Design a protein around this ligand. Sequence first.
Ligand code: SF4
Lengths: 1122, 783
Amino acid sequence: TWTDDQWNAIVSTGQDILVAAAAGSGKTAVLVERMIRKITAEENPIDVDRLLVVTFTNASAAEMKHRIAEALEKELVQRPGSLHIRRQLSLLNRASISTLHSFCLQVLKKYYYLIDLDPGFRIADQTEGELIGDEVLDELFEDEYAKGEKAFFELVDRYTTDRHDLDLQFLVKQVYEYSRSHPNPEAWLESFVHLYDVSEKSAIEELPFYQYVKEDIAMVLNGAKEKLLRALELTDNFLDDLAQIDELIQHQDDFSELYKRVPAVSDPALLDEATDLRNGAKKLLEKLKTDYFTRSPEQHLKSLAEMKPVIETLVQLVISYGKRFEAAKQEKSIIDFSDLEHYCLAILTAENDREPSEAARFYQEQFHEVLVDEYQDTNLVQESILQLVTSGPEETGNLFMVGDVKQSIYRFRLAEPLLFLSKYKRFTESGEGTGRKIDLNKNFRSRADILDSTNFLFKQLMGGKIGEVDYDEQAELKLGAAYPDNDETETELLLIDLETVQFEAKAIAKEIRKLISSPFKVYKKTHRNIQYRDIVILLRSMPWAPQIMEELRAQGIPVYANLTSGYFEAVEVAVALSVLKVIDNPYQDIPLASVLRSPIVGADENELSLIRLENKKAPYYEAMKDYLAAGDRSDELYQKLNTFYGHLQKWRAFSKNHSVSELIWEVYRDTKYMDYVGGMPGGKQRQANLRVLYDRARQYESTAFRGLFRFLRFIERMQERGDQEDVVRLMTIHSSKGLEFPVVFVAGLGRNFNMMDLNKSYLLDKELGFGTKYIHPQLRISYPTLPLIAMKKKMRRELLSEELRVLYVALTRAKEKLFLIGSCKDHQKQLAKWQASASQTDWLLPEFDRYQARTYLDFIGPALARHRHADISGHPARFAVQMIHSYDSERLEAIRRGEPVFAFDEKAREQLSWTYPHQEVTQIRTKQSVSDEYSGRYRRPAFMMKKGLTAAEKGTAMHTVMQHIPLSHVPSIEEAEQTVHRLYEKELLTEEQKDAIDIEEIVQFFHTEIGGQLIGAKWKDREIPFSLALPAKEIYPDAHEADEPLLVQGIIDCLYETEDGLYLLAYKSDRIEGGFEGAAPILKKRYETQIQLYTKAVEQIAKTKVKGCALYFFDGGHILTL
Amino acid sequence: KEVFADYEIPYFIDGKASMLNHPLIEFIRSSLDVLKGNWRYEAVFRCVKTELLFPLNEPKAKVREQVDQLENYCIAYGIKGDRWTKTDQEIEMENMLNDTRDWIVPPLFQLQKRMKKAKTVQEKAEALYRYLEETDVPLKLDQERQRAEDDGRIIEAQQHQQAWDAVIQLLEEFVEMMGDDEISLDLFQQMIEAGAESLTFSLIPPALDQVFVGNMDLSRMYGTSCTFVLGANDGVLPARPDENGVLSDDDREWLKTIGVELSSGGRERLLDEHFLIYMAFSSPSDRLYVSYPIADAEGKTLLPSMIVKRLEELFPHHKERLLTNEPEQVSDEEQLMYVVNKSVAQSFTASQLRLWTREYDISDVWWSTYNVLMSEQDRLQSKKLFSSLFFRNEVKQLERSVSRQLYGERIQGSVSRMETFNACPFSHFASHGLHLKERQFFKLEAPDIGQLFHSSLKLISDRLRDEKLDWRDLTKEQCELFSYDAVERLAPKLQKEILLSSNRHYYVKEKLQKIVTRVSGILSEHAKASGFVPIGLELGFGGKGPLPPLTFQLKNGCTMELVGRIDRVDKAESSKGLLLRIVAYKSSDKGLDLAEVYYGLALQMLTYLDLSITHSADWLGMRATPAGVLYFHIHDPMIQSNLPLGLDEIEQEIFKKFKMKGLLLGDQEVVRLMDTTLQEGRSNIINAGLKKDGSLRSDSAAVGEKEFDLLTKHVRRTFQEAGEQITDGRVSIEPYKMKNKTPCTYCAFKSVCQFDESLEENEYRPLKAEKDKTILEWIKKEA
DNA sequence: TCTAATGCGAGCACTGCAGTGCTCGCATTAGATTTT
Ligand code: SF4
């Protein structure tokens, strides 16, 4: 069965539809069914290729195809005579179901000729692409420096830390990369200046950015008052303060007014707690003052208008970068992932003087409906592409989108959830003359205590400017699980107070072992004890990942976490590269030493220093050689070196003829480093690391780069800048996604969010554009500009929204049990901070206090306190709080040298001593020609070479003639020429070959005895191809064991038959006269072997016998018999 | 190829091999690159390293090394473009460098003469050809052909002069079609480039007994017993309709209806895929294996194709095996299939013993395998391999016979050399013991910048005195002039004239200038206030110089003559007698942390101070008491204030930020001698203040003369205890973490020390952040 | 780089030379720390 909401999503039609699918909505199943119907229905079915389905991964798309396939089979078994249904089953491979990028690719491939794009274009990975950006940038900056334009230097002096210019070039990238999130980058770039065009005559309450200044003041002022009022309830001077505040609240609108007021005017438990509340006012007001009111509205304006010249320079720079970048790609026929979307949009839009091009029209025609998953993460470029392949205005049309704003956690990649949210508020629950929207509340996959705990917290947290979304019914999760009633399913909070992570990791570790030793049986299925793989620890970031893993594996099950970097500081990688470095250039003291001391060689410290002694001044490399040369053979350290120096020179030569990836593998199998690395702790991850280096070398050969040197720098770049077992899985909340677990630990909840983004001298924003500090290089003075401050306030409450959703996916990824684990300093006090916040009724916490939040605790804590004022504390959510004070053999030693002392003792012995019986024939060529790529046996350019022929080419020419000469009778010098000319006409002879033929030497043969005999005969044939199977030995004596037959193939020049028997004939252009009496013996032995094979072939295959064989020689016209 | 090479399985591949990795193809490409990108040294050595330019008859061994050394050179000196075309130790070197380029430049150079001059194709294709012959490519090729054979590789030897024809036929066809057509390198090279990519090697002829590895389309087979099918992945096996060619699937399908038949290509192929997988599945007589990988080359997920599903429909009860390199995941049976070869047996056993010590119960097949390998001849190696089982990165203490002859008779100490030791004993061994040197580049590093400032400042003095002038007599006009000229004299002679190399650097020039100009003005303002007058400047301390080195005698025949520099020493007369303080110019902010001093990380200032004090008596005939140690911050500031400021107040804020940080003396007068402008409140020149009563503030960085003479002694004992450990031959590895920071930051020797925390026995020695007093009393307790 | 965040020293108000809290101001000092 379905819910009415699912049923709606499945059957609705006639307009755009937005499906808000909560966690575990079963959206996939519903998405499948909807397509299944339109494709398999009695009324009037449609083919699959008429649908467009975009997903966020090729795996989920592939997943889509499988589930579509099954249902088709099922639908088929019932209608076994369905021609349409069977056909659809064949269309799934031709259907468009993929990531939007995957679609864009198909578009570019098809309509490439409309834009400027080389078919067979290549997609560069985000790495080489950036490395190209660095290059074009350096060229750009160099050109500007040389051009010496005034404006340029003003921009540089201003934004780069003098003493180096590095800082300017990532601002350029940062800006560029941002612009690409816009359907029209350039325009959006030129949009920057419009903000900085202002006068002292301008109204600040008007312009765009002040919106966030307005709302900021509103909060703080109100937050002040609301923070004071309680001090009054605590029960004088708070009325002076208060009255003054009210006076400010009256003028919240007038900014110029605030500049006049704000700057100028401004029990021992509850007694000393009421004083800090009054300080809250001070602190909040002081900040309010410093931010906006330390300078006049007029001076703020002047400060702004002054930076306009700079902003223009900056923009024109980024634009020049964009052009150069694109041009650089074109040269190498490549594109980025941004290009993929933008070129597609370019194809889809053909504007003259904005039009949905005829390419667009095709896709609008082709797709009857378009389905987009994870829509909350869509950007502007994608959306404009979507709106373009979708046919019809919003009221009607075939756009069908599904997702959940509450689960939008990717804004740092510039995804726009407001796009989804704007449509949700624009759409009605019905379909009347607008986009139809549907909600999926039921969570079929999670237990009640989960949904209740999650619904409980985010009801007091998500909302207004922090949540960006009102948390209400039709939004709240609803129970659809059939879970049996059981306890210890309660959500737990473990509060604890470098070692921070240690005390944090153990608390986690503990309850885990509680779970394992204790029953706790996970779940018409049946209960299951904890397999360690059903439990997971989710972190926001991965600085603690390594530390956690350690002690969690210190006792019991090990830990698996998907590590990203720290890869270049990995010992193996270091050593491996070190080896490649020495192979490239042996003259590097550090890289060489790093190898010699590594397990690969294993030199001692005394051995290393011993080496240097030989030569102190010279580089270490030859200090090693100098040790070798004069060294004594019986020396151990000498061995180690000599062996290594042997490999080095082998590797040196090897890379010369081979690729980098190949050399790497060779080094791995020569040193057995990868094998060795598998024998030390964590050797599994180490081996992986060692073989991704090989993979990256593979990815590197397909790039615009080549050679070992470039590869090294390539890796050097990555360094400098970017970089079925049952175990506890440690992973980021961001990587959690559609994944799901019985038990979920979310730790680090007591750690600050990353606000580092809002600090620097500049900020990039979608709406507002570019913002920066006022900076004067001559006066050496700088300070935040008004827009800058405005962009921060906005960005902070948007960044905070993101975190509340990140925390929302964390809790929803659980099916049965939850662990919330935070950390702080002083227990009680924070709970008092929380008490202060948790007073206000209405559920949803104070919009300002949520704002002040820094750490996840600041969200949970206060929302948790009020729980355990009617429904809030009676809410069917359960919790368990823990206040933690934070403080509370022979075989190896045999292996160390020799062997120990089995069931397989006998088999292991023979398999290692085994041999391939037919081995010695495995390297021998099957076919072997005698004169097709399947057989075996200093040229100068024709334009620089002579005019004539070579002895070989002449011979071939002479040969051809003899084989085409009519054997009817004895030809004359003339009749021979006629043949030579006929060949020439028919093109069996090149103009040269013709002129190179000596007719006499050809006619001569037919005057010899053999000639006359050839003429007069019962039967004759020439150019006779043959293949003769022989025992391998018969040719190759060397190998003696295997007697498998090989094919010897050749052509018998001539065979003729007389009343005597069968005779053989061969013409040879060998040079003789320069008598022939002495040449005969030599010639005889030259073709001695060949001729026997000929007769062999005839005698064995034809089962007749060859009596005598003649050879003719054009030089002198001789003959000899064998 | 790799896998089967290891597993010793002979095979035959349908496809052919690209020639893009062949020396001849490279040499050609890189050559054109050399004269297009205008002699980027990367390209030059790209050609030289195909060693087709190598001198004739001269032993390769040397040649390589000479080439490498030349490479290093070109890298550190940024040699490019025209630079190419333009007594004991340096002769050997510099001449080798002139010999090497002497056989490199001419051939590659003469070519560019030819190329650029030639207009049409044929003459360009020809100029290229000569470049090959005049360098004797054929000869050297043939030579290399031999070495391949003598090493057992004939196949490789065959591809050599087989590569020779490929390039020629390319030229021939080129000059055939467009030979007499005009054109220049831009397009000419592009076509050569596309020619190389297309170049192929002759298909490797089949052998009597081989495994047949080929495609699933046009490959043919006969009498096949067992057939394995690879990549049954979805999107792969029933290959998604390929989007290629000039005509779209739509176009072709349309043409059909007009009575025109073309190649299928689009959707028909997808119909034909089933026939092709049908022939594949029915190919073998005995067995059929259909496999698919779960993960990706990079780790992405991969699903099976619809074929596997249907196979499961025709054989619902058929189980499907698992292919893994983790034998413990399978039964003893399968685990016995890994012992196919010595090498692979080893590689697997090593990993099994590992996972075994981890408390996991392994299979006895590997114990058997172990004992077998342990009974052979190459036992030795396997033994090595298995030593990995217990590998703790171990540093064997040096011995006496080595440390002595290595480190030398006298250990000529440096304050920096001592800091590097106590930072991490191993780093010392690598730097001063093994004398390891990083590769030099043409980048201007942060430190060398400092060396500029010094010499600039030192230079400014000389001219001041020469005009009988002093910093305080200076004007804002003069500060600028004087400073600029200083960098003029210097810039060209700094770091391989990198400042003159590119445009970005000549901007970095006046950048460094404007800094000095400011610092010059600040010093003036500091001289008009300070009552301290400089005595010695850049005082030569140790070795050959104004002062005797300070010596260290300790048990075990130890000798430590440590040398050093003294940036500035200043004198001021008070009622308490002579006063001496030391100033050192610095790039960063903070100067002295007592916590760092305890562990001997910062001994610079305190050690300098002693000498000045101690030697004061003899030196200038008077006993001095320490005024303190100061750090001057060299930089051009950016103040940030919310308060609007006038030029008046701006100069104040700029001035305040050069406020010196360090360690002072805690009496009223010493402060006032350092800042004579100060009456009450805080000082902008130095970190100290004065209450109304005349006493200074608790915020002052000042301490009693006792504490000063306390630290000084501590620095001594450090040089002693750390001075002997060296002679003892201690090279151990012990990085510190304090406070939350480490010495491994930019440390170059990290790859040599190979420090691994996870691996036990390798630890970070912790140091604790300490209130200046908390390490103060610690010192007090020592003696 | 860069917000909080304590210190330390007096100036002032609050009440009885004089004391006590309170407050401000100026600086250095921690203490921090991304996602794919
Ligand atoms: S990185 Fe660490 S272990 Fe390595 S040399 Fe430096 S201080 Fe020593």
